[PDB]
Amino acid sequence: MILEEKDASDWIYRGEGGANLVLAYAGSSPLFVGKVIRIQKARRNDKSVLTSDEQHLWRENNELISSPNKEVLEQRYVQNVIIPLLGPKHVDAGVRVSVSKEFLECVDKKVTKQRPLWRVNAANVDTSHDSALILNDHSLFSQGITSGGDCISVEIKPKCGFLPTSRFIGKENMLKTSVSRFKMHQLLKLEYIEISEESEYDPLDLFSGSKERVLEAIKALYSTPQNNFRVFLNGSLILGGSGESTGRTSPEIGYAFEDALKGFIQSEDGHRTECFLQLVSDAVYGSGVLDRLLEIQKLDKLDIEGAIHCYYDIINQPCPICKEELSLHALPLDESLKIVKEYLIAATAKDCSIMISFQSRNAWDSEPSGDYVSLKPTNQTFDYKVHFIDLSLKPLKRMESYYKLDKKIISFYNRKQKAE
Numbered sequence: 526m527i528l529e530e531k532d533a534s535d536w537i538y539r540g541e542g543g544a545n546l547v548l549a550y551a552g553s554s555p556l557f558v559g560k561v562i563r564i565q566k567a568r569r570n571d572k573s574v575l576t577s578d579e580q581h582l583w584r585e586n587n588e589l590i591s592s593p594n595k596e597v598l599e600q601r602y603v604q605n606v607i608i609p610l611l612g613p614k615h616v617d618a619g620v621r622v623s624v625s626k627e628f629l630e631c632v633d634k635k636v637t638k639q640r641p642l643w644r645v646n647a648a649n650v651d652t653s654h655d656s657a658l659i660l661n662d663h664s665l666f667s668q669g670i671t672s673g674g675d676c677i678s679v680e681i682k683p684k685c686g687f688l689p690t691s692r693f694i695g696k697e698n699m700l701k702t703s704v705s706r707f708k709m710h711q712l713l714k715l716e717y718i719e720i721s722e723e724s725e726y727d728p729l730d731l732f733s734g735s736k737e738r739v740l741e742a743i744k745a746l747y748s749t750p751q752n753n754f755r756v757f758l759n760g761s762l763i764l765g766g767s768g769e770s771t772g773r774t775s776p777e778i779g780y781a782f783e784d785a786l787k788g789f790i791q792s793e794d795g796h797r798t799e800c801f802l803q804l805v806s807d808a809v810y811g812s813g814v815l816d817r818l819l820e821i822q823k824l825d826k827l828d829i830e831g832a833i834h835c836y837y838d839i840i841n842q843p844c845p846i847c848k849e850e851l852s853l854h855a856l857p858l859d860e861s862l863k864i865v866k867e868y869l870i871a872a873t874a875k876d877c878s879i880m881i882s883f884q885s886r887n888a889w890d891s892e893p894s895g896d897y898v899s900l901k902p903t904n905q906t907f908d909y910k911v912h913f914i915d916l917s918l919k920p921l922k923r924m925e926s927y928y929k930l931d932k933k934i935i936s937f938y939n940r941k942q943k944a945e
C-alpha cells in the first residue's frame with residue numbers, strides 16, 4: 526500500500542516514454558509479481574491536475590475533472606474514455622499505489638545509469654507525486670505466474686495509420702494528402718539527429734487490412750525498430766531501444782535476436798526470425814485489433830489544420846491562424862469542444878503501443894483461449910493476447926504545438942521535395 530525506500534531495490538529498468546519511467550518488478554510479493562510500475566517524470570521541459578480550459582473540455586466526464594492527482598487522472602481517462610472505445614478486453618487501467626518521496630528519489634538514482642542520457646537530461650521521476658501506477662507486465666503472458674511457460678512479447682508503436690482527407694489542409698500542405706505523417710516526420714528527426722536513417726516502416730501498410738502489407742510492415746519494423754518496435758523474452762528486452770528509439774538492426778543484433786528465440790519459435794537456426802515475424806503478422810492481422818485502434822485515430826476528422834481553429838475558439842483567444850474558416854468558427858462552442866476533444870483522443874490513439882504476448886498453446890487450459898495463430902512452417906499453435914499501453918491524456922495546451930510541429934514537418938518535407 527506504501528512503497529518505501531527499501532522496496533526500490535526490487536524494481537528494475539524496463540524503459541521510458543517522454544512522460545513516464547516504467548520499472549519491472551523483480552521481487553516476490555504476490556502483490557507485484559507480473560506487474561510493472563509506471564512512474565511519472567518531471568520534465569524540466571514542461572512547467573491543479575487539470576487546467577481551466579481542460580476542465581471545460583473534459584466537462585462531459587466529471588470523474589476526470591475532479592481528480593486529486595495526475596496518476597488518478599490517467600486512470601479515469603483510460604477507464605472512462607478509452608475503454609468504452611477500445612474495449613476492456615485489451616486495455617487495463619492500472620491500480621494506483623502510494624509511494625514515498627524517498628522511494629522515488631531512490632528509484633530515480635538506482636536506474637539513472639540504465640537510462641539514455643538524453644532522457645535524463647530531459648526529465649526525472651517527479652518526486653512530488655504520492656502516487657504511481659501498477660500495471661500488469663504484459664511481457665509476461667497472464668497475471669499470476671501460473672506460467673504457461675515462456676513468453677515472447679512484442680510491443681508496436683504504430684503511430685498514425687491514415688492520410689488526412691480534410692477540406693482544411695492548406696494549398697501547400699496538400700502533400701499531407703499523399704504521404705503519411707510518419708514518413709514525412711522521419712526526414713525531420715533525421716535532420717534533428719534523432720535517428721540515424723529513415724525507417725522502413727509505413728503505418729499505411731500496417732493498418733491497411735492487407736495480411737500481406739501487414740507482414741511487410743512487421744518486417745520493416747524489425748529492420749528499423751527506431752522507437753516503434755521492441756521484443757521481450759520474459760520481460761527482458763531482446764530487440765529495440767531501451768527507453769529510446771534504436772538504430773537499424775545490424776547483423777550482430779539480428780544474430781542476438783535469432784539466438785534469443787530458440788525453443789520458442791521452433792525452427793532451424795536462422796529461420797526463427799522469419800517465422801517469428803510471420804507469426805507476429807498473423808496475430809496482428811487475425812486479431813484485427815488495429816482496425817479498432819484506427820477508428821479512434823480517425824477521430825482526428827478535420828486534421829490539425831482543421832482542429833487548430835476550434836482550439837482557439839475553445840480557449841477564447843482570437844484565432845492567430847486566420848489573419849486580416851467562415852466555416853469552423855461558426856460552430857457552436859458545443860460542437861467545437863467535441864472536435865478538439867476527439868482530436869486529443871485521436872492523439873492518444875496515435876501514440877499508444879500494442880503489446881502482443883505469445884505462448885505455445887497448452888492442451889491443459891480450463892477454457893481454450895480463442896486467439897491463437899498456427900504457424901504453418903513450424904506446426905506450432907501459439908496463443909496470443911493483445912493489450913494497449915501508454916494511453917496518456919494529452920494536455921490541451923498542446924494543440925498550439927501540434928500545429929507548429931505539423932507545420933514544420935510539412936514545410937521541411939516540401940522543401941526536400943523541391944530537391945528534384
Ligand SMILES: O=P(O)(O)O[C@H]1[C@H](OP(=O)(O)O)[C@@H](OP(=O)(O)O)[C@H](OP(=O)(O)O)[C@@H](OP(=O)(O)O)[C@H]1OP(=O)(O)O
Binds near residue numbers: 541752770876
Ligand atoms: O520521446 P519520443 O520517443 O520521441 O516519444 C514521443 C512521445 O511519446 P511517448 O513519450 O509516449 O513515447 C510524445 O508523447 P509525450 O511522451 O512527449 O507526451 C509523442 O507526442 P504526442 O503523443 O504528444 O504527439 C511523440 O509523438 P509525435 O512525434 O507524434 O508528437 C513521440 O515522438 P515519436 O513517436 O515521433 O518518437
Ligand SMILES: Nc1ncnc2c1ncn2[C@@H]1O[C@H](COP(=O)(O)OP(=O)(O)O)[C@@H](O)[C@H]1O
Binds near residue numbers: 540545661
Ligand atoms: N503494461 C506494460 N507492460 C510491459 N511493458 C510496458 C507496459 N507499459 C509500458 N511498458 C514499457 O515501458 C515503455 C514506456 O512506457 P510508456 O507507458 O510508453 O511511457 P511513456 O508513454 O511516457 O513513453 C513501453 O514502451 C513498454 O516498453
Ligand SMILES: [Pb+2]
Binds near residue numbers: 541542876878
Ligand atoms: Pb510510449
Ligand SMILES: [Pb+2]
Binds near residue numbers: 542543544915
Ligand atoms: Pb506517453
Ligand SMILES: [Zn+2]
Binds near residue numbers: 847
Ligand atoms: Zn481560425
